Amino acid sequence: DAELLVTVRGGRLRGIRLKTPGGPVSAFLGIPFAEPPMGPRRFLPPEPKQPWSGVVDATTFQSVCYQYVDTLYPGFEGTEMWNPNRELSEDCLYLNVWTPYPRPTSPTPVLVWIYGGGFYSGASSLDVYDGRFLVQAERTVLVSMNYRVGAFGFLALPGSREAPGNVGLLDQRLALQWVQENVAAFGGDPTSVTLFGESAGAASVGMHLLSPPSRGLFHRAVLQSGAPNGPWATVGMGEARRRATQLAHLVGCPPGNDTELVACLRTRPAQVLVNHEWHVLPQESVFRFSFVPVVDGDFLSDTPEALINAGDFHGLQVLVGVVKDEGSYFLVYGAPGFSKDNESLISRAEFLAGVRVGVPQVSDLAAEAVVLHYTDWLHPEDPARLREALSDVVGDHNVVCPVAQLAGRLAAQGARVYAYVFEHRASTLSWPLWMGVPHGYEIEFIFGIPLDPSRNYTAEEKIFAQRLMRYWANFARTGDPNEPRDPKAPQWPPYTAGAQQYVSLDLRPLEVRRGLRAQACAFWNRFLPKLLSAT
Amino acid sequence: DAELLVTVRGGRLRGIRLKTPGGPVSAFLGIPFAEPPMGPRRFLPPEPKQPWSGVVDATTFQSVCYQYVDTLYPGFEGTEMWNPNRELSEDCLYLNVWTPYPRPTSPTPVLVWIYGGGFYSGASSLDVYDGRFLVQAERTVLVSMNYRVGAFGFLALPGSREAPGNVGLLDQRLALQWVQENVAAFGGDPTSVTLFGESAGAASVGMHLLSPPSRGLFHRAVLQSGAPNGPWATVGMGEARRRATQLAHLVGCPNDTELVACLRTRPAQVLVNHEWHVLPQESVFRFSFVPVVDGDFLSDTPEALINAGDFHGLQVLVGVVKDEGSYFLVYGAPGFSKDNESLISRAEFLAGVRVGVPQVSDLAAEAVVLHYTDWLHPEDPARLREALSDVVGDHNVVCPVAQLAGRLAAQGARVYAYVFEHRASTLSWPLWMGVPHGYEIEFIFGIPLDPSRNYTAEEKIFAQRLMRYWANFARTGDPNEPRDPKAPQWPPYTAGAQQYVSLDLRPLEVRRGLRAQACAFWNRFLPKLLSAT
Ligand SMILES: *[C@@H]1O[C@H](CO[C@@H]2O[C@@H](C)[C@@H](O)[C@@H](O)[C@@H]2O)[C@@H](O[C@@H]2O[C@H](CO)[C@@H](O)[C@H](O)[C@H]2NC(C)=O)[C@H](O)[C@H]1NC(C)=O
Ligand SMILES: *[C@@H]1O[C@H](CO[C@@H]2O[C@@H](C)[C@@H](O)[C@@H](O)[C@@H]2O)[C@@H](O[C@@H]2O[C@H](CO)[C@@H](O)[C@H](O)[C@H]2NC(C)=O)[C@H](O)[C@H]1NC(C)=O
Ligand SMILES: CC(=O)N[C@H]1[C@H]([C@H](O)[C@H](O)CO)O[C@@](O[C@@H]2[C@@H](O)[C@H](O)O[C@H](CO)[C@@H]2O)(C(=O)O)C[C@@H]1O
Ligand SMILES: *[C@@H]1O[C@H](CO)[C@@H](O[C@@H]2O[C@H](CO)[C@@H](O)[C@H](O)[C@H]2NC(C)=O)[C@H](O)[C@H]1NC(C)=O
Ligand SMILES: O=C(C[n+]1ccccc1)NNCc1cc(C(O)O)nc(-c2ccccc2)n1
Ligand SMILES: [Cl-]
Ligand SMILES: [Cl-]
Ligand SMILES: [Cl-]
Ligand SMILES: [Cl-]
Ligand SMILES: [Cl-]
Ligand SMILES: [Cl-]
Ligand SMILES: [Cl-]
Ligand SMILES: [Cl-]
Ligand SMILES: [Cl-]
Ligand SMILES: [Cl-]
Ligand SMILES: [Cl-]
Ligand SMILES: [Cl-]
Ligand SMILES: [Cl-]
Ligand SMILES: [Cl-]
Ligand SMILES: [Cl-]
Ligand SMILES: [Cl-]
Ligand SMILES: [Cl-]
Ligand SMILES: [Cl-]
Ligand SMILES: [Cl-]
Ligand SMILES: [Cl-]
Ligand SMILES: [Cl-]
Ligand SMILES: [Cl-]
Ligand SMILES: [Cl-]
Ligand SMILES: [Cl-]
Ligand SMILES: [Cl-]
Ligand SMILES: [Cl-]
Ligand SMILES: [Cl-]
Ligand SMILES: [Cl-]
Ligand SMILES: [Cl-]
Ligand SMILES: [Cl-]
Ligand SMILES: [Cl-]
Ligand SMILES: [Mg+2]
Ligand SMILES: [Mg+2]
Ligand SMILES: [Mg+2]
Ligand SMILES: [Mg+2]
Ligand SMILES: [Mg+2]
Ligand SMILES: [Mg+2]
Ligand SMILES: [Mg+2]
Ligand SMILES: [Mg+2]
Ligand SMILES: [Mg+2]
Ligand SMILES: [Mg+2]
Ligand SMILES: [Mg+2]
Ligand SMILES: [Mg+2]
Ligand SMILES: [Mg+2]
Ligand SMILES: [Mg+2]
Ligand SMILES: [Zn+2]
Ligand SMILES: [Zn+2]
Ligand SMILES: [Zn+2]
Ligand SMILES: [Zn+2]
Ligand SMILES: [Zn+2]
C-alpha cells in the first residue's frame, strides 16, 4: 500500500493500515513530536524534536508517560481499562494520526483528542481512544497526543526557570503546533481543527481557550465532563510551591534553596516520585490531585474563573456536556463505606464524613451548608438516599456546576454553545448498578467502539454510536452538531444563558430539557462563594 | 327562666338564651374577672375583681381593649371582621361563658379560647368567635376572655415595678384562675380544660405551656397558626425598653418610675396613635409591644424552654393554613394589593424579602433569596409572588410551628398536626391569597351553621367534622373517634415520620413533613449563619 509512506517536516514516516468492519483506515502511531524530556529536561518545557534521517517506524504505539497505576481493583475491567497499556517511560512525547483510507483529496477537518485522568494519569494508547472507527465512518482526520502527567508535567516552583509549571500543557501546545505544520500531509485542514477531551482533557481544552498562544491553533472546542474552572483543575502559586517542596522533603532533599531543590528531584528515580505523590495533598479528599496546572501568569494569565468572565469568545463554537452520574465513581476512592461490591448503603455519620472529603478545605460553616442543602429532611436516615445524595454533592461541585458556569459565560459573550447530558448505561458496563452512568463511560460511544467485532455491544447501541459520531463529526465540520438541514423531528437547539437548553443523549431520540441542575448550581456558583469570602 | 341566673364566687349573674338551629344555649357574656386596670393600674398586673352586690347583666359582650383599628381597606369584610365591634375601653377585663341549655348534670370538659392579633388587637366579641355552635353541637363549655393588647398589655421597662411586662399574659392566667374556681357553676369540669387559640393567641397558649404557674390551670393545648418561638412573638429586655422609651419620647414624656408616671397621664387614644411609630425598621409581620423575656413569666427564651422541657403528660393539637404568608403582604410589601393580581417584579421581590425578614444581615437575606428564587424562571412575576408568600409564611408561622412540634413530640408529648386547606366559599379576599391566615377559625367555630351566613351545605358538614375533631381532642386528647377503627385515622405527629392530616372537604389524608425541606433552612441553617456572621 502506497498510502502508508508520508513525510512530515522532520523526516519520513512508515504507517500501518488498520482494519474496521466498514473498510480500512491508514494510521501513524508514535510520531515523535518532542525531544525526550529526560534527566536534566525533567520538569522543563518541551523542546521540538530535532529532524531525523531514515524512516520512523510509526506503526505501533509509543510508551506511556510515567504515572500512578491503579491497584484498587486488581484485574477488574473497569479500573484496568484506564491503567497504562504500554510500558512506562519518561520518553513518551509522541502523537498519533488516523486518516481516511484513500487520503481525502480535499482538505478535511481535524479532530484533536486530549485524554483525561485528573492530570496524574492517562495515555493516548488506550483501547477506548482507538480512532479508526471515527475516521472510517465520518472521514475526518483524528490526532491524539501523549502529555506528561503528575509531577513530570505539573510540579511547579513558581518563578524558578527549573520547574516553571504547566509543562504538560506546553506538551499539548507543542503537539497542536505540530498539527498546524504537518496535518496537511495527511489530508487535514489546519484552518479547521476542533479540540475534544474528557475529564482533565476537557479542562485542558478549556485552558487552551483561555491562553492566547493556543487560540490560533484550533477553531472549535468540545468539553466532555470537565471544565477549567473546576475546583480540582487549578492551583495557586503558593500551594503549588508548598506541594512541590513537600514532595522534595517527602523524598529526602537536604542541603539557592530552590535550584538546589530541583536538582535533587532530578536525581530520584521516576517511581520514587510517583510513590510519594499522593501524600503531598493538603487534606484527605476525593476528586483532588496533587499536581495540576498552576495559575502562574504565563500560561494562565489569571484564575480561570477570571479569564472566563471577560474573554474573547465571540464566534467560538463549543460543544459541552456531562454524564448523568458524574460523582459516583470517585466515591469508592475515599468516601467511608463505599465499595464497587456492596450496595454502598452509608449511614448519616458516614455521609457527614464523606461530605468533608467530597468538599475538602472549606470552612466548617460551609460544610454544614452542604450537609443541610443535600439532606432529604423527610428521609434523612435513608442509606440509599444518603448514598446518591453524596454522589450528587461530588458530581455537582466538581463537574456539573463548573461546566454549567462555563457554558453560560461563553454563551453570554457570544459563543455558539451546544450542551448535552449523556444518560445511557453500556450493557458491557462492569461497575455496579448503583453507580449509574459514571464519569468516562460516554467515551467508548463517541469513539464508535460498539462497531468492534470483538466487543459485545447491542444492535441498539451500534446505531446509537453511529449517531454520536455523526453529532461530533457535524460539529467539527460545521460548528453545529445538528444533522445538517434535517426535517426529521429531533432538533438540537443551542445553549443560552437564559433558556439553558440541552439535549439528553441516550437510546431514545433527543429530548430538549431546560436547566443543567439549575437550582443546585445556584448554591455552588452563586451562594457558596459568599460564605467563603464573607466569613 | 331560672337557668339563666347563676352565682359564681363573687356575686350573681344573669345570662341570655342563644338560638341555634340545633337547639338553644345559655350564655354569660361580659363577666368581670379583674378590677379595671385604669389610672395608676395601667401597665400593672391585673387585680382580681372583688365581689359585687346585686346581679351583673351578663347578657351582652363587654368592651374591647384599646387598640389600633385597621383602615387599610375601609368597609371591606376581609379586614373589618377583625376590627372592634364594641366600644374601646381600658375597662375591658371581662370573660364569656357558653354552656348547653340543659345545663350539664355531669361535669363536662371546657374549651378556653384565646384570640390572636399580633398582641396589638383583637376581641373575644368578634363574630367568628361566637361560641354558640360549638357547645350546642358537641355539648361542651366554652370560655373566652379579653386581655390587654398594645402598650396596655405589653409595654415593658424590664425590671421596674411600674411597667414589668407581659401583663396581657397575666390577664390571661388570671382568667384561667377564674375558670378553675367558677367553671363548675356552669357545668364545666375544671379537670378537663383545653386551651386553644390562633395567631398571637396560639403563641400565648405556647407561653402558658412554658410558664410553670400557668401549667396547672389547663391539661391540653391547641395551637393554630402560631407558636411562642416565632420571630415576632417575643422581644429582648434591651429591645423592649428601647421601644417603651421611644414611645414616651413620641408622646412628650421626659429614670423609669418617672417615665411610666408620665405615660399614665395620657389618654389611651394618644398612645394607640403612636404605636406603630416605634418599630425599628420597615417590617411586615412585626408588632411593637409583645411578650418580653424578663425572667418572671418566661424564665428564659421560649426556644430555650422548649429545648430543655419535659412534656410527658401533655397532648397538643397543632396546625397551619395552606398559605400563611399571603395576608400580610398587602401590609407593606412593594407591589401587592387585594385589588389587583400582585404580579411583582424581581426587584419588587428582592425588596419584599428585606421587609419580610427584617433585621438580618445582607448575607442572610442573600441566602433567603437564592433559596427562594426559581433559577429557571427567576423573573416570572407569578412565581415571584408565591415565593414571597412562602418566605414570610415559612419564616413566621410554618417553620416555628413545625419546630415546636418536633420538640414536644420528641420530649414526651402526644402531638397531632393538620394543614387547613379549604378556602371558604364566602371568602372576600382575592383568589391569589389562597387560604389566608386566620380563615380556618370560622370553620372551627362552626359558623357555617348560622343560617344567615350563606355557606355551602357541604361546607356545613365540613365544620361539624372539624368541631368533632376539636371536641374529641378536648375530651380525650385524641382527635379520632374511639369506637370507629374504620374512620380515616389521624396519626400522631412525630419528629421522624412527621405525619399530619389535610383538613379540607376530602376525607382525612395523611402527608409527611410540614414543609420539611424549606424549614431546615429556617430552623437549622440560618441561625448558624447569623452566628458565624
Ligand atoms: C461496603 O464495603 C466497605 C469496604 O470495606 C471492605 O473493603 C475490602 C478491603 C474488604 O475488607 C471487604 O470486607 C469490605 O468490602 C465497608 O466499609 C469498611 O467496613 C470495615 C468493617 O465493617 C471497616 O474496618 C472499614 O474501615 C470500612 N471502610 C471504610 C469505613 O472506609 C462497608 O461497611 C461495606 N458495607 C456493607 C458490608 O454493608
Ligand atoms: C398592583 O397594585 C399595587 C398597589 O396599588 C394599589 O392598587 C392599584 C390597583 C392602584 O389603583 C394603586 O393606586 C393602589 O394604591 C401597585 O403598586 C403601587 O404603585 C403606585 C404607583 O404610583 C405606588 O405609588 C404605590 O406605592 C404602589 N404600591 C405598593 C404597595 O408598592 C402595583 O403597581 C399594581 N400593579 C402590579 C402589576 O403589581
Ligand atoms: C517557558 C514557558 O513557561 N513558556 C514557553 C513556551 C515553550 O517554549 C513551549 O515549548 C511551548 O510549546 O512557549 C511560549 O511562547 C511560544 C514561542 O516560543 C513559539 O515559538 O511559538 C509559540 C506559538 O504558539 C508560543 O508563542 C508560550 O507558549 O508561552 C513562551 C515560552 O518560551
Ligand atoms: C425616679 O425619680 C423618682 C422621683 O419622682 C424617685 O421616686 C422617689 O420615691 C420616693 C419614695 O420611695 C419619694 O421620696 C419620691 O417620690 C422620690 N424621691 C426622690 C428623691 O426623687 C424614683 O426612685 C426614681 N426611679 C428610679 C431611681 O428608678
Ligand atoms: O392580623 C390582622 C387581622 N387578623 C387578626 C387575627 C387573625 C387573622 C387576621 N391584621 N394585621 C394587620 C397588620 C399587619 C402589619 C404587619 O406589619 O404585620 N401591619 C399593619 C399596619 C397597620 C397600620 C399601619 C401600618 C401597618 N397591620
Ligand atoms: Cl521515534
Ligand atoms: Cl540532571
Ligand atoms: Cl524503535
Ligand atoms: Cl475527498
Ligand atoms: Cl478563534
Ligand atoms: Cl476558578
Ligand atoms: Cl497561598
Ligand atoms: Cl497564590
Ligand atoms: Cl536558586
Ligand atoms: Cl528512573
Ligand atoms: Cl456563520
Ligand atoms: Cl443530570
Ligand atoms: Cl428515614
Ligand atoms: Cl423521591
Ligand atoms: Cl437521527
Ligand atoms: Cl425540562
Ligand atoms: Cl434544574
Ligand atoms: Cl342572636
Ligand atoms: Cl360593679
Ligand atoms: Cl345583694
Ligand atoms: Cl348530661
Ligand atoms: Cl402568678
Ligand atoms: Cl424564642
Ligand atoms: Cl431583641
Ligand atoms: Cl395624638
Ligand atoms: Cl399609622
Ligand atoms: Cl438576583
Ligand atoms: Cl450586614
Ligand atoms: Cl404517650
Ligand atoms: Cl348547597
Ligand atoms: Cl417538604
Ligand atoms: Mg495559593
Ligand atoms: Mg510562589
Ligand atoms: Mg516530616
Ligand atoms: Mg472554619
Ligand atoms: Mg439530625
Ligand atoms: Mg466498557
Ligand atoms: Mg436542580
Ligand atoms: Mg381568681
Ligand atoms: Mg440589646
Ligand atoms: Mg423627635
Ligand atoms: Mg439575577
Ligand atoms: Mg424542624
Ligand atoms: Mg369569610
Ligand atoms: Mg387514636
Ligand atoms: Zn478516568
Ligand atoms: Zn440550604
Ligand atoms: Zn453576536
Ligand atoms: Zn405625635
Ligand atoms: Zn440555598
PDB file of C-alpha atoms in Angstrom, chain B residues 270-446:
ATOM      1  CA  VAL B 270     -52.896  59.096  72.300  1.00  0.00           C
ATOM      2  CA  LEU B 271     -50.750  56.060  72.963  1.00  0.00           C
ATOM      3  CA  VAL B 272     -52.562  53.935  70.365  1.00  0.00           C
ATOM      4  CA  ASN B 273     -51.906  56.584  67.701  1.00  0.00           C
ATOM      5  CA  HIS B 274     -48.127  56.275  68.095  1.00  0.00           C
ATOM      6  CA  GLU B 275     -47.819  52.517  68.486  1.00  0.00           C
ATOM      7  CA  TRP B 276     -46.576  51.559  65.020  1.00  0.00           C
ATOM      8  CA  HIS B 277     -44.190  54.512  65.007  1.00  0.00           C
ATOM      9  CA  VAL B 278     -41.924  52.603  67.402  1.00  0.00           C
ATOM     10  CA  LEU B 279     -40.864  49.524  65.333  1.00  0.00           C
ATOM     11  CA  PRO B 280     -37.188  49.725  64.290  1.00  0.00           C
ATOM     12  CA  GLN B 281     -37.473  49.164  60.518  1.00  0.00           C
ATOM     13  CA  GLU B 282     -39.860  48.615  57.636  1.00  0.00           C
ATOM     14  CA  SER B 283     -41.478  45.356  58.566  1.00  0.00           C
ATOM     15  CA  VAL B 284     -44.360  43.160  57.536  1.00  0.00           C
ATOM     16  CA  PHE B 285     -45.008  40.659  60.342  1.00  0.00           C
ATOM     17  CA  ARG B 286     -43.703  42.641  63.317  1.00  0.00           C
ATOM     18  CA  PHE B 287     -45.515  44.328  66.225  1.00  0.00           C
ATOM     19  CA  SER B 288     -44.307  46.929  68.726  1.00  0.00           C
ATOM     20  CA  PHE B 289     -45.340  45.533  72.114  1.00  0.00           C
ATOM     21  CA  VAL B 290     -45.102  41.767  72.598  1.00  0.00           C
ATOM     22  CA  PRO B 291     -44.080  39.367  75.387  1.00  0.00           C
ATOM     23  CA  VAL B 292     -40.607  40.016  76.743  1.00  0.00           C
ATOM     24  CA  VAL B 293     -38.034  37.612  78.219  1.00  0.00           C
ATOM     25  CA  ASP B 294     -37.969  39.178  81.664  1.00  0.00           C
ATOM     26  CA  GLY B 295     -37.412  36.117  83.830  1.00  0.00           C
ATOM     27  CA  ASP B 296     -40.684  36.276  85.719  1.00  0.00           C
ATOM     28  CA  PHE B 297     -43.115  34.794  83.197  1.00  0.00           C
ATOM     29  CA  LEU B 298     -40.634  33.270  80.752  1.00  0.00           C
ATOM     30  CA  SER B 299     -37.652  32.222  82.856  1.00  0.00           C
ATOM     31  CA  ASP B 300     -35.633  32.062  79.596  1.00  0.00           C
ATOM     32  CA  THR B 301     -36.200  32.454  75.849  1.00  0.00           C
ATOM     33  CA  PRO B 302     -39.204  30.470  74.556  1.00  0.00           C
ATOM     34  CA  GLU B 303     -36.901  28.318  72.455  1.00  0.00           C
ATOM     35  CA  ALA B 304     -34.568  27.644  75.411  1.00  0.00           C
ATOM     36  CA  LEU B 305     -37.588  26.388  77.361  1.00  0.00           C
ATOM     37  CA  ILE B 306     -38.828  24.101  74.554  1.00  0.00           C
ATOM     38  CA  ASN B 307     -35.418  22.526  74.097  1.00  0.00           C
ATOM     39  CA  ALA B 308     -34.919  21.694  77.738  1.00  0.00           C
ATOM     40  CA  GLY B 309     -38.569  20.972  78.556  1.00  0.00           C
ATOM     41  CA  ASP B 310     -40.107  17.660  79.597  1.00  0.00           C
ATOM     42  CA  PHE B 311     -43.625  17.313  78.180  1.00  0.00           C
ATOM     43  CA  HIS B 312     -44.753  13.833  79.258  1.00  0.00           C
ATOM     44  CA  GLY B 313     -48.447  14.079  80.149  1.00  0.00           C
ATOM     45  CA  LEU B 314     -49.312  16.715  77.519  1.00  0.00           C
ATOM     46  CA  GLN B 315     -51.460  16.338  74.406  1.00  0.00           C
ATOM     47  CA  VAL B 316     -51.093  19.099  71.807  1.00  0.00           C
ATOM     48  CA  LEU B 317     -53.060  19.686  68.632  1.00  0.00           C
ATOM     49  CA  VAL B 318     -51.221  21.848  66.159  1.00  0.00           C
ATOM     50  CA  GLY B 319     -51.558  23.157  62.631  1.00  0.00           C
ATOM     51  CA  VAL B 320     -51.348  25.837  59.944  1.00  0.00           C
ATOM     52  CA  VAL B 321     -53.359  27.003  56.937  1.00  0.00           C
ATOM     53  CA  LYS B 322     -52.233  26.450  53.354  1.00  0.00           C
ATOM     54  CA  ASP B 323     -50.803  29.939  52.654  1.00  0.00           C
ATOM     55  CA  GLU B 324     -49.785  31.602  55.913  1.00  0.00           C
ATOM     56  CA  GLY B 325     -47.960  34.427  54.184  1.00  0.00           C
ATOM     57  CA  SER B 326     -50.322  35.922  51.624  1.00  0.00           C
ATOM     58  CA  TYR B 327     -52.424  38.012  54.046  1.00  0.00           C
ATOM     59  CA  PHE B 328     -49.555  40.032  55.402  1.00  0.00           C
ATOM     60  CA  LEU B 329     -48.066  41.045  52.072  1.00  0.00           C
ATOM     61  CA  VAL B 330     -50.663  43.751  51.391  1.00  0.00           C
ATOM     62  CA  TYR B 331     -49.483  45.471  54.601  1.00  0.00           C
ATOM     63  CA  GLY B 332     -46.219  46.798  53.192  1.00  0.00           C
ATOM     64  CA  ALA B 333     -44.793  44.565  50.640  1.00  0.00           C
ATOM     65  CA  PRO B 334     -43.940  46.515  47.451  1.00  0.00           C
ATOM     66  CA  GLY B 335     -46.386  45.889  44.617  1.00  0.00           C
ATOM     67  CA  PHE B 336     -49.102  43.930  46.460  1.00  0.00           C
ATOM     68  CA  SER B 337     -52.784  44.624  46.877  1.00  0.00           C
ATOM     69  CA  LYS B 338     -56.001  42.710  47.377  1.00  0.00           C
ATOM     70  CA  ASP B 339     -57.365  44.606  44.353  1.00  0.00           C
ATOM     71  CA  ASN B 340     -55.001  43.510  41.588  1.00  0.00           C
ATOM     72  CA  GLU B 341     -53.096  40.275  40.912  1.00  0.00           C
ATOM     73  CA  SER B 342     -49.947  41.443  42.699  1.00  0.00           C
ATOM     74  CA  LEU B 343     -47.540  40.328  39.953  1.00  0.00           C
ATOM     75  CA  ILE B 344     -44.324  41.714  41.390  1.00  0.00           C
ATOM     76  CA  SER B 345     -41.116  42.499  39.548  1.00  0.00           C
ATOM     77  CA  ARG B 346     -37.910  40.814  40.617  1.00  0.00           C
ATOM     78  CA  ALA B 347     -36.638  43.996  42.238  1.00  0.00           C
ATOM     79  CA  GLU B 348     -40.009  44.343  43.959  1.00  0.00           C
ATOM     80  CA  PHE B 349     -39.387  40.782  45.206  1.00  0.00           C
ATOM     81  CA  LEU B 350     -35.854  41.398  46.471  1.00  0.00           C
ATOM     82  CA  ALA B 351     -37.119  44.478  48.305  1.00  0.00           C
ATOM     83  CA  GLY B 352     -40.025  42.419  49.683  1.00  0.00           C
ATOM     84  CA  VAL B 353     -37.580  39.906  51.137  1.00  0.00           C
ATOM     85  CA  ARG B 354     -35.957  42.692  53.164  1.00  0.00           C
ATOM     86  CA  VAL B 355     -39.248  43.822  54.685  1.00  0.00           C
ATOM     87  CA  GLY B 356     -40.442  40.242  55.235  1.00  0.00           C
ATOM     88  CA  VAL B 357     -37.399  39.015  57.098  1.00  0.00           C
ATOM     89  CA  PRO B 358     -36.296  42.299  58.645  1.00  0.00           C
ATOM     90  CA  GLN B 359     -33.204  42.723  60.781  1.00  0.00           C
ATOM     91  CA  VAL B 360     -30.863  40.068  59.350  1.00  0.00           C
ATOM     92  CA  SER B 361     -27.526  40.506  57.617  1.00  0.00           C
ATOM     93  CA  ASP B 362     -27.023  41.175  53.924  1.00  0.00           C
ATOM     94  CA  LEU B 363     -25.624  37.653  53.580  1.00  0.00           C
ATOM     95  CA  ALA B 364     -28.650  36.327  55.442  1.00  0.00           C
ATOM     96  CA  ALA B 365     -31.082  37.968  53.030  1.00  0.00           C
ATOM     97  CA  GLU B 366     -28.988  36.816  50.088  1.00  0.00           C
ATOM     98  CA  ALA B 367     -29.251  33.219  51.358  1.00  0.00           C
ATOM     99  CA  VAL B 368     -33.029  33.669  51.595  1.00  0.00           C
ATOM    100  CA  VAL B 369     -33.115  34.941  48.043  1.00  0.00           C
ATOM    101  CA  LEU B 370     -31.171  32.118  46.431  1.00  0.00           C
ATOM    102  CA  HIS B 371     -33.161  29.613  48.396  1.00  0.00           C
ATOM    103  CA  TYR B 372     -36.492  31.033  47.199  1.00  0.00           C
ATOM    104  CA  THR B 373     -35.570  32.116  43.671  1.00  0.00           C
ATOM    105  CA  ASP B 374     -36.565  29.615  40.969  1.00  0.00           C
ATOM    106  CA  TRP B 375     -33.429  29.754  38.846  1.00  0.00           C
ATOM    107  CA  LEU B 376     -35.133  28.544  35.675  1.00  0.00           C
ATOM    108  CA  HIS B 377     -37.781  31.304  35.966  1.00  0.00           C
ATOM    109  CA  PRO B 378     -36.016  33.959  38.063  1.00  0.00           C
ATOM    110  CA  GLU B 379     -38.226  36.759  36.827  1.00  0.00           C
ATOM    111  CA  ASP B 380     -41.669  35.194  36.405  1.00  0.00           C
ATOM    112  CA  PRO B 381     -43.867  37.563  38.482  1.00  0.00           C
ATOM    113  CA  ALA B 382     -46.447  34.928  39.499  1.00  0.00           C
ATOM    114  CA  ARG B 383     -43.682  32.650  40.727  1.00  0.00           C
ATOM    115  CA  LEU B 384     -42.071  35.618  42.490  1.00  0.00           C
ATOM    116  CA  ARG B 385     -45.371  36.367  44.216  1.00  0.00           C
ATOM    117  CA  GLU B 386     -45.880  32.886  45.660  1.00  0.00           C
ATOM    118  CA  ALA B 387     -42.231  32.825  46.666  1.00  0.00           C
ATOM    119  CA  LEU B 388     -42.653  35.894  48.883  1.00  0.00           C
ATOM    120  CA  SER B 389     -45.888  34.421  50.291  1.00  0.00           C
ATOM    121  CA  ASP B 390     -43.738  31.417  51.186  1.00  0.00           C
ATOM    122  CA  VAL B 391     -40.882  33.461  52.606  1.00  0.00           C
ATOM    123  CA  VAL B 392     -42.991  35.200  55.197  1.00  0.00           C
ATOM    124  CA  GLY B 393     -45.270  32.230  55.815  1.00  0.00           C
ATOM    125  CA  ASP B 394     -42.394  29.813  56.343  1.00  0.00           C
ATOM    126  CA  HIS B 395     -40.255  32.172  58.443  1.00  0.00           C
ATOM    127  CA  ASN B 396     -43.081  33.500  60.661  1.00  0.00           C
ATOM    128  CA  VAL B 397     -45.558  30.636  61.130  1.00  0.00           C
ATOM    129  CA  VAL B 398     -44.842  27.294  59.490  1.00  0.00           C
ATOM    130  CA  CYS B 399     -41.223  26.622  60.448  1.00  0.00           C
ATOM    131  CA  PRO B 400     -41.743  27.886  64.035  1.00  0.00           C
ATOM    132  CA  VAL B 401     -44.869  25.654  64.425  1.00  0.00           C
ATOM    133  CA  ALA B 402     -43.083  22.623  62.962  1.00  0.00           C
ATOM    134  CA  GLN B 403     -40.013  23.224  65.095  1.00  0.00           C
ATOM    135  CA  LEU B 404     -42.080  23.368  68.296  1.00  0.00           C
ATOM    136  CA  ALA B 405     -43.916  20.214  67.266  1.00  0.00           C
ATOM    137  CA  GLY B 406     -40.838  18.052  66.742  1.00  0.00           C
ATOM    138  CA  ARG B 407     -39.569  19.063  70.170  1.00  0.00           C
ATOM    139  CA  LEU B 408     -42.770  18.451  72.140  1.00  0.00           C
ATOM    140  CA  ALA B 409     -43.212  15.093  70.445  1.00  0.00           C
ATOM    141  CA  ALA B 410     -39.599  14.001  70.938  1.00  0.00           C
ATOM    142  CA  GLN B 411     -39.723  15.040  74.609  1.00  0.00           C
ATOM    143  CA  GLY B 412     -42.848  13.234  75.791  1.00  0.00           C
ATOM    144  CA  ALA B 413     -45.936  14.951  74.387  1.00  0.00           C
ATOM    145  CA  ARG B 414     -48.513  13.370  72.112  1.00  0.00           C
ATOM    146  CA  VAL B 415     -48.859  15.718  69.154  1.00  0.00           C
ATOM    147  CA  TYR B 416     -51.357  15.848  66.315  1.00  0.00           C
ATOM    148  CA  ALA B 417     -50.832  18.097  63.281  1.00  0.00           C
ATOM    149  CA  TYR B 418     -53.056  19.379  60.464  1.00  0.00           C
ATOM    150  CA  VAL B 419     -52.829  21.660  57.471  1.00  0.00           C
ATOM    151  CA  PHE B 420     -56.021  23.596  56.828  1.00  0.00           C
ATOM    152  CA  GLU B 421     -56.543  23.545  53.080  1.00  0.00           C
ATOM    153  CA  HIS B 422     -60.107  24.694  52.382  1.00  0.00           C
ATOM    154  CA  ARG B 423     -60.962  28.132  51.019  1.00  0.00           C
ATOM    155  CA  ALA B 424     -64.308  29.377  52.303  1.00  0.00           C
ATOM    156  CA  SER B 425     -66.855  29.835  49.529  1.00  0.00           C
ATOM    157  CA  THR B 426     -67.630  33.217  51.085  1.00  0.00           C
ATOM    158  CA  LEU B 427     -64.015  34.484  51.336  1.00  0.00           C
ATOM    159  CA  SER B 428     -63.796  38.196  50.395  1.00  0.00           C
ATOM    160  CA  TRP B 429     -60.037  38.233  49.851  1.00  0.00           C
ATOM    161  CA  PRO B 430     -58.786  37.811  46.272  1.00  0.00           C
ATOM    162  CA  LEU B 431     -58.020  34.394  44.879  1.00  0.00           C
ATOM    163  CA  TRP B 432     -54.211  34.692  44.723  1.00  0.00           C
ATOM    164  CA  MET B 433     -54.141  34.783  48.541  1.00  0.00           C
ATOM    165  CA  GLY B 434     -55.290  31.151  48.652  1.00  0.00           C
ATOM    166  CA  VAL B 435     -56.205  30.002  52.130  1.00  0.00           C
ATOM    167  CA  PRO B 436     -55.124  33.039  54.170  1.00  0.00           C
ATOM    168  CA  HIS B 437     -54.014  33.216  57.778  1.00  0.00           C
ATOM    169  CA  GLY B 438     -56.930  33.114  60.170  1.00  0.00           C
ATOM    170  CA  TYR B 439     -59.515  31.641  57.807  1.00  0.00           C
ATOM    171  CA  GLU B 440     -59.962  28.240  59.414  1.00  0.00           C
ATOM    172  CA  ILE B 441     -61.373  29.911  62.558  1.00  0.00           C
ATOM    173  CA  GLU B 442     -64.913  30.239  61.162  1.00  0.00           C
ATOM    174  CA  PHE B 443     -64.943  26.515  60.486  1.00  0.00           C
ATOM    175  CA  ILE B 444     -63.581  25.514  63.887  1.00  0.00           C
ATOM    176  CA  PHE B 445     -66.330  27.622  65.496  1.00  0.00           C
ATOM    177  CA  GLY B 446     -68.985  26.141  63.207  1.00  0.00           C
TER     178      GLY B 446
END
